[PDB]
Symmetry: C2
Subunit: 202 residues, 2 copies
Amino acid sequence: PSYKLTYCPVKALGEPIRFLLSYGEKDFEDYRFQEGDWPNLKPSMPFGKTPVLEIDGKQTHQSVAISRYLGKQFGLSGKDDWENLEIDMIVDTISDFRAAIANYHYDADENSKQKKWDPLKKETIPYYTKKFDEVVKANGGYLAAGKLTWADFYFVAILDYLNHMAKEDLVANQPNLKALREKVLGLPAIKAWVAKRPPTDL
Amino acid sequence: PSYKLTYCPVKALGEPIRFLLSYGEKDFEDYRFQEGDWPNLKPSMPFGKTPVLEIDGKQTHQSVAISRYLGKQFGLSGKDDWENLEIDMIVDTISDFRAAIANYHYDADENSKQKKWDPLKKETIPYYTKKFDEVVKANGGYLAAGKLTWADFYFVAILDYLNHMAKEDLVANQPNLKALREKVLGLPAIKAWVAKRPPTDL
């Protein structure tokens, strides 16, 4: 169909969608709006945020919801309700992890922000990176359902965004996560997209 | 099929699951841990948080992922992929709304917290409540897919928690949302549950 993605000129929450559409070998317009273009676009987005993926004229939003839908379209979802649960559960956990990082990163009060630095690095980050690595090992190198799913694509696609905010390489000391990253980035459709895409830090 | 729910002695993020199980005419152990016991429970949860739902022994977590699953079990999901996407998008949007509220409410610094009050009350709350009201009206009194779905159970179940944090009845002046609440709370299984459940401010 006709796909048009609208998002920031970075990877972040748009990248999982770009990863998935690529893997599905679907052509899509990759519209990246300029900084001064946003006040113009915001009012026409369903809840004033992006990513927004137009699918045959119809607006869709929410990076996770879209990723799940596209996952089912391209054969990357569970075989049954329970596998889809396992996928959904771990991705919402990725979101919790992102929220913990973003809570420091986007904090506008320097005093309060600095207060969150130590806890993030000393408790939160080590905890999740470990738990996630355990989960990956337990599924034989995947995040859920003992196989490659749209969660692996979502996770790896936003990883640079997570690293940038956390100011560290989150999977460097986590071998199963590191291998999952290498694996997903190693898939041809992704490898091909990654060599094409604009380089950004997020 | 056995069910055992583990969560705080409040409504909040556990309530959606209690609502759906009730609606599905399923008995379940509603375990509510005491404050002093949490330090020892935490490590036994998949990622150190509740709600956790044991489904025939198998642990599940993440309020939204669990609700999507149960919703499909009890005939409260989409007829196809597009409809389930529609439901998914509106629920993740509710999560965004909750995060904006929670950002103020859990701000431990009275200085940063106060900066967040006015924007929350003047911009965020009116924005989301009006938008959700439009959607519910445009869907004939439901949050998605023109029919009752698990989105409606999720929204109404957490609404008190949202009201407590926002320090106001958020739907008091949104008639389509107010009618949705009364509709869900009206349901026999819910009404029975609401009468039976321990009462809390959130």
